[PDB]
Structure formats: structure tokens, C-alpha cells
Write a protein that binds this DNA or RNA. Structure first.
Ligand SMILES: [Zn+2]
Ligand SMILES: [Zn+2]
Length: 688
RNA sequence: GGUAAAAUGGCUGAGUGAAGCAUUGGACUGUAAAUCUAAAGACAGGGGUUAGGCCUCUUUUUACCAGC
């Protein structure tokens, strides 16, 4: 077969603060993703990009925002059933993959291949990929540029020209003739030499593109001195059609970098990916939040997404900003396409909401009907399960007990993007008030994103000049193993975390080391809390919950994912609010016990038997992520948890009226789940 | 919400072009059932390479989504 005739270069991530720059290559035979940062999988799912079917993943910098989402992509590939997958990047990649198996489990069902930089190159029928290691003058100092060249595209045959004279067009005899013409062998027939030039166009050797990342000025000189780039610079046998620079704005304005890259020539297109992007990625989440805000303000606050404040400076050659969903076309025609750019238009969402069936009447009735502690802020950053999707992110909740103190509690993959989308530009101040973080259990979706929040908190603290206060993390002994396995070859950031085992915090437990001594004290008398206790749950090995009591006598208990635990009862008694799991729903008791989930019915049961004033669910299943069915058991002490939800103690006599409008908003989706899940599960149970 | 499999007609086998069973007037047959010399409906809805077969966007049908 001939060379590919449809190659597209697209960006899934614009290199924003939330997530690092990510590329995407679409070809008729193979697909590539290059850098796999945090949240790139969710963006690909949102943009309809096929998560599976990926052939190669190329890593450049080996940095968390560039490799944080690799675990999620690997898990998704494993679930999808992809048989083969190849990973390439720095030679120490295999070490990172090994640490993943500690908590992610064996990678059965999918074959993973690690290609170190020592390998010469990787061949393909669609294009060839090289690798030129780069070393800085100042291991996190190693970056790699790939440089990709396409294959020969055979010229099309002039069928009309051949038919004009009387060649056997439309018959099997034409196949050898066209095969010989395309190959390059002259064909003589009918007593004359037709020659290939009169039957086909000259062959096209194909273009090429270069991917290079310059984290800082330190890498400018090594890049300039690179010998390989010299051959492709200026005139060359394979002109480079496009080059992408994943470098900060300051580095781009550097005179040396501009002079070196200017040798590429005027025909070379340049693309820059950095924090200066001006595109919005998640339209569905923004629409959902805007629609929810129309019901009750101050409980679903507007995202107030950050926006660029400085226009890109003029340079020697015009530049095209990274943006989102920007695609560059190769092979058929070299041009830029912008027919799929994402823009935020809240007016359309408002108009669509105004046309909802009877939603306006319900909202008006609720408003007509509507018409204590002031800062017990509780915000649910995420409420979904593992494998985050567009509608919601993995479970993650934060509480702002005091303006100067806060508790992160569970923190899943990333969640700094969620924090930025929630508080906007105010995250910098908020991130500096973080006091401690607690992980639920060994599952990756609850503790995989810790490095990102750690780095972001460190950056925020350094921005204001405040000294460095080590963060307190309450995780089992399993987490420390992963942390020590990591950071030994990439970052060495062990100074930003202090471990406090949860076993010593268990009710009736005893301190087993002086390290916890004065450490529990530092944790206390700082969050306005009186004693902190934990206990095991019936979920899996090394699973613990947390109970927090304020100095004023307000008590809140968080359990997480587990079966109804009798030990939890009699310990969280008189708790103002409680947090449980509602992964599954009624009618799936067999799956609930098999999957080790309480389910909504058992959670509500313990809720009435727990005496807690308020019962709040969490960790909604992906099958009912849009909204869980409101069972008749709902009472004044229950509620519904949603992403970016904000609830105060004074809202207790206010939320009951929200059920009608919330159920009205989700009509089509609720009908879909009712028609799909309940009947199917009932039929399956009856058959079995 | 995601993954796997098939979209051809009254039914059904594939990709040189379309192949097998069923019926319209009936001949052997007083009798309308035996064996045909003609008949027909024809590859779900787009588009990229020019070609069917290849890849992508929707629509309809079956199955699956579990404790680390
Ligand atoms: Zn879990
Ligand atoms: Zn969980």
C-alpha cells in the first residue's frame, strides 16, 4: 500500500495552568498522543477523540503535569481491552511504570513496551520518528526532540489521459500498467513509449514536523548547539512543514532562540503552546454549572474562569496561538483549519434552559416558596468514581473551616483544575491556607493527584514570599512506599510532605513513635478542632475514615466507600453532617455486595439509624453520574451532591425545595436511566 | 457514559459481478404440487483517497463494563 493521504496535527491541551501541553496526531493507519498530562484523557473523551486505538505515547520532559495522567490513560486502555501499546521517552520511564503497578495492579490484558532513548528509531508505515537526546548545561535536565518525517506519497494516475488514447481502462489489465507506472518503470505499448511522465505526477517525498520543548533558558544553548537540527535547518531534502515549541513566553522572546529558530525558513509554520492560551475546554461542565446556578445562587457559584491578560508580543514571523482543538492538515493540502474551535456562550445555555419543559414554572414556584454558623464552608470538588468523565471528576471534597485554615481531605487525580475553575484567580490566596490532606485508601483515584496539588501549593506559597511550611498528610503506610519509590530519580521533593499514619489516630489507639508526638498536636489547635479520630471500614485492606469535631461543638464525619459499618455507628454520634457513598442504587444489592459498596438504600438506612442531622452521599457511579434517582426514602436529612457544590449550615432549612427543580432539569437523562438500567437488571436477575 | 459484533430484499452466501430458495399464463399432470426457456425488487444515510473491498461522521439491533 501507499503512504498515508490524511494526516492531521491537533492539540488536546493548550498548555494551560491546569494541564500541560499535549499533542495529537490522526493518521489513516496509526494514531499518536505525545505528552500525556493531567486531565488529557478527560479532554479527549469530551472532544470525542478515541481514547483507545492509540499506538505510541511520546514523553519529552518527564514531569508530573506532563506524565500525571499517564496512569489514567493506562487504566482506560486496560479496560478498553487494547492488546498492544508502546511507550517511549526518557530511559528512566520503566521505573515510573513499575511504581504504577504498586497501586494500579498488574497490567494484564494489555502489552506495554518501553522504548529507551538508546533505541535508534521507531519505524512505521505512516511515518518515521527519530530521537535526539538533549542535555542541559546546568535526572530532570533531560529533554528529547523527535522530528517526524512522512513517507512517500505515490502520485495519482491520470485515468482520463490514458482513456483518451484507448488504453484498457476499467479492466484487470490496467492494474499491471498502473503498478508499473507508479513504480517508475517506463511502459511501451501500441508501438510508442508512453513514458511515466505522461501518465502520473512526479512523486512527492513528503513533509516533516519537529516537536521540541524548552522549559527554561538553560536549554536554549544545548538546543542551539544540537548537530541534528542543523541538517533540517534552512534548505534540506525534507523541508519541515510545522514546528511546535512548548516553551514559556519569556524564553520565546529570547534573542538567541529567535535567531536559531529563524533558520527554519519562511515556509515553516510555528506554533507555541504555553500558559498564554485563551481557549475553554469543558463546555458541558460550564453549561451544567450555569444551569444549576439559576436554581440557588451562593450554592452553585459561577466558575469565573481565568482569562489571558497579556497579548502575545510581535516577533520576526507571525505566530498562531495554541488555542484548543486547533488542527493542522498535512498531505492533501497544507493549511490551517479552525472549524472546531470551542467558545463559551452562556447566552445559548440560558436560552436552552428557558425552553425546558415546565422548568420555568418549577423554578418560579420554588422562588415564591423561598421568599447559626456563618462560615462552616463545605465544598465538594468532585463526586464521581474512578475513570473521571466529562460530567464530573473523581471524588474530591474540601472544607474551609476558617479563612486562614482548611482541610483538603480526599484529593483525586489533579483537582487543581477544579479549584482554579471554582475560585478563579482567588486560588492563589486559598492554596496558601491549606493545612493538611487525608487520603481514603490505596485506590489511585483518591491519592494519585497529590503531587500536582503539592507543586501548585508550593508555587503559590513561593509567589507571596511566605516561608515554606511542610504539609501534613494522613495516609496509610502504603502511600509512603509509593512516595519513596518516586521522587528518587525525577524531582526529589520529599521535603514538602510529613506523614502521619492513620493507625495511631484510630479510636483507642496508642502512639507507636515519637514522630506522631507533637505532630498530632500540630494538626490540632490549628484547625479549631477538638481531638481527631479514625476507624477501619469494611471496604478493603488499609481503609480508614475520619471524624472531625470543631471547638464550638460541631461534629462532621466522613466515611468514604465501604459497606455499612457498625464500628462507624456509635462513634460519629451527634454528628451535624455525615458523608457516605451512593455508588450503586436500589435493585443492585448483589452487585453492591460483590463490588463492596453500601448503595443508596443501605446508606440512607444507616443514616436514619446514625442519628446524624444531615446525610450527604458521595462517590456517585459512572452509570448514574448525571443524577441518581430520588427514591421515596428521601427525607429532610438527605441531599444530592454535585461537583463544585457549596453548602452552609444555614442552608439546612432551605435545600428540601430544590428536589423538584433538580428532578425537572434532568428529564431526558433520568428517563434514559429508568428505561435502561432498572428493567435490564430486573430481567437479568429474573433470568438468573 | 464507554467497549465488542452485524446493517444487502419475503428468507439467505460474498466483494471479477452481483448468487440460491420463493412467483406471473403452463405445458408430463383430468388438478391448481414434480422439471423452464423471460420477468422483478439489489450492497442502511453522508465524505477522503478516485475506484466495490479501505478509513471517518450519524442512525437504527445483540452482548459486556467485578472485590487489587
Ligand atoms: Zn475506592
Ligand atoms: Zn473510590
Amino acid at each position: 500500500s501507499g503512504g498515508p493521504n490524511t494526516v492531521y496535527l491537533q492539540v488536546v491541551a493548550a498548555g494551560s495552568r491546569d494541564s500541560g501541553a499535549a499533542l495529537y496526531v490522526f493518521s489513516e493507519f496509526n494514531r499518536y498522543l505525545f505528552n500525556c498530562g493531567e486531565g488529557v484523557q478527560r479532554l479527549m473523551q469530551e472532544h470525542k477523540l478515541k481514547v483507545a486505538r492509540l499506538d505510541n505515547i511520546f514523553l519529552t520532559r518527564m514531569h508530573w503535569s506532563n506524565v500525571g495522567g499517564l496512569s489514567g490513560m493506562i487504566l482506560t486502555l486496560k479496560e478498553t481491552g487494547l492488546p498492544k501499546c508502546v511507550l517511549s521517552g526518557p530511559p528512566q520511564l520503566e521505573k515510573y511504570l513499575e511504581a504504577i503497578k504498586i497501586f494500579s495492579g498488574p497490567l494484564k490484558g494489555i502489552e506495554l513496551a518501553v522504548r529507551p532513548h538508546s533505541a535508534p528509531e521507531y519505524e512505521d508505515e505512516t511515518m518515521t520518528v527519530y530521537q535526539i537526546p538533549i542535555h542541559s548545561e546546568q535526572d530532570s535536565s533531560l529533554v528529547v526532540a523527535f522530528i517526524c518525517k512522512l513517507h512517500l506519497k505515490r502520485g495519482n494516475f491520470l485515468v482520463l489521459k490514458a482513456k483518451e488514447m484507448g488504453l484498457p481502462v476499467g479492466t484487470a489489465a490496467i492494474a499491471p500498467i498502473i503498478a508499473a507506472v507508479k513504480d517508475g518503470k517506463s511502459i511501451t505499448h501500441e508501438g510508442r513509449e508512453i513514458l511515466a511522465e505522461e501518465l502520473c505526477t512526479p512523486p512527492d517525498p513528503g513533509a516533516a514536523f519537529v516537536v521540541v520543548e524548552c522549559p527554561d533558558e538553560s536549554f536554549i544553548q544545548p538546543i542551539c548547539e544540537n548537530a541534528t537540527f542543523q541538517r533540517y535547518q534552512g534548505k534540506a531534502d525534507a523541508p519541515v512543514a510545522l514546528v511546535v515549541h512548548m516553551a514559556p513566553a519569556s524564553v520565546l522572546v529570547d534573542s538567541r532562540y529567535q535567531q536559531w529558530m529563524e533558520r527554519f525558513g519562511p515556509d515553516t509554520q510555528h506554533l507555541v503552546l504555553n500558559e498564554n492560551c485563551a481557549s475553554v475546554h469543558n463546555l458541558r461542565s460550564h453549561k451544567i454549572q450555569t444551569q444549576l446556578n439559576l436554581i440557588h445562587p451562593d450554592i452553585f457559584p459561577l466558575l469565573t474562569s481565568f482569562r489571558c491578560k497579556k497579548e502575545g508580543p510581535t516577533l520576526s514571523v507571525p505566530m498562531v496561538q495554541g488555542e484548543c482543538l486547533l488542527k493542522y492538515q498535512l498531505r492533501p493540502r497544507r493549511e490551517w483549519q479552525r472549524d472546531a474551535i470551542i467558545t463559551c456562550n452562556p447566552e445559548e445555555f440560558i436560552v436552552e434552559a428557558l425552553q425546558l419543559p415546565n422548568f420555568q414554572q418549577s423554578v418560579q414556584e420554588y422562588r415564591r416558596s423561598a421568599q447559626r454558623s456563618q462560615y462552616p464552608e463545605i465544598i465538594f470538588l468532585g463526586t464521581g468514581s474512578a475513570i473521571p468523565m466529562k460530567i464530573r471528576n473523581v471524588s474530591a471534597t474540601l472544607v474551609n473551616i476558617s479563612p486562614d485554615t482548611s482541610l483538603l481531605l480526599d484529593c483525586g487525580e489533579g483537582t487543581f483544575g477544579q479549584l482554579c475553575r471554582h475560585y478563579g484567580d482567588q486560588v492563589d490566596r486559598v492554596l496558601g491556607t491549606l493545612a493538611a490532606v487525608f487520603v481514603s485508601h490505596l485506590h489511585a483515584d483518591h491519592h494519585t493527584g497529590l503531587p500536582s496539588i503539592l507543586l501548585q501549593r508550593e508555587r503559590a506559597l513561593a509567589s507571596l514570599g511566605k516561608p515554606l511550611h511542610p504539609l501534613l498528610v494522613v495516609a496509610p503506610n502504603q502511600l509512603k512506599a509509593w512516595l519513596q519509590q518516586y521522587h528518587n530519580q525525577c524531582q526529589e521533593v520529599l521535603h514538602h510532605i510529613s506523614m502521619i499514619p492513620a493507625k495511631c489516630l484510630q479510636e483507642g489507639a496508642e502512639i507507636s513513635s515519637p514522630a506522631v508526638e507533637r505532630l498530632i498536636s500540630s494538626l490540632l489547635r490549628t484547625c479549631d478542632l477538638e481531638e481527631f479520630q479514625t476507624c477501619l471500614v469494611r471496604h478493603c485492606k488499609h481503609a480508614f475514615g475520619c471524624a472531625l469535631v470543631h471547638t464550638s461543638g460541631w461534629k462532621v464525619v466522613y466515611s468514604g466507600d465501604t459497606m455499612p459499618c457498625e464500628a462507624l455507628v456509635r462513634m460519629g454520634k451527634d454528628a451535624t453532617l455525615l458523608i457516605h457513598e451512593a455508588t450503586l442504587e436500589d435493585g443492585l444489592e448483589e452487585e453492591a455486595v460483590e463490588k463492596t459498596h453500601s448503595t443508596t438504600s443501605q446508606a440512607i438506612s444507616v443514616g436514619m439509624r446514625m442519628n446524624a442531622e444531615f446525610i450527604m452521599l458521595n462517590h456517585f457511579s459512572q452509570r448514574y453520574a448525571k443524577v441518581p434517582l430520588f427514591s421515596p426514602n428521601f427525607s429532610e436529612k438527605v441531599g444530592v451532591a454535585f461537583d463544585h457544590m457549596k453548602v452552609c449550615f444555614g442552608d439546612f432549612p432551605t435545600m428540601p425545595k430544590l428536589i423538584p427543580p433538580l428532578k425537572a432539569l434532568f428529564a431526558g437523562d433520568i428517563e434514559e436511566m429508568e428505561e435502561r438500567r432498572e428493567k435490564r437488571e430486573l430481567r437479568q436477575v429474573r433470568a438468573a
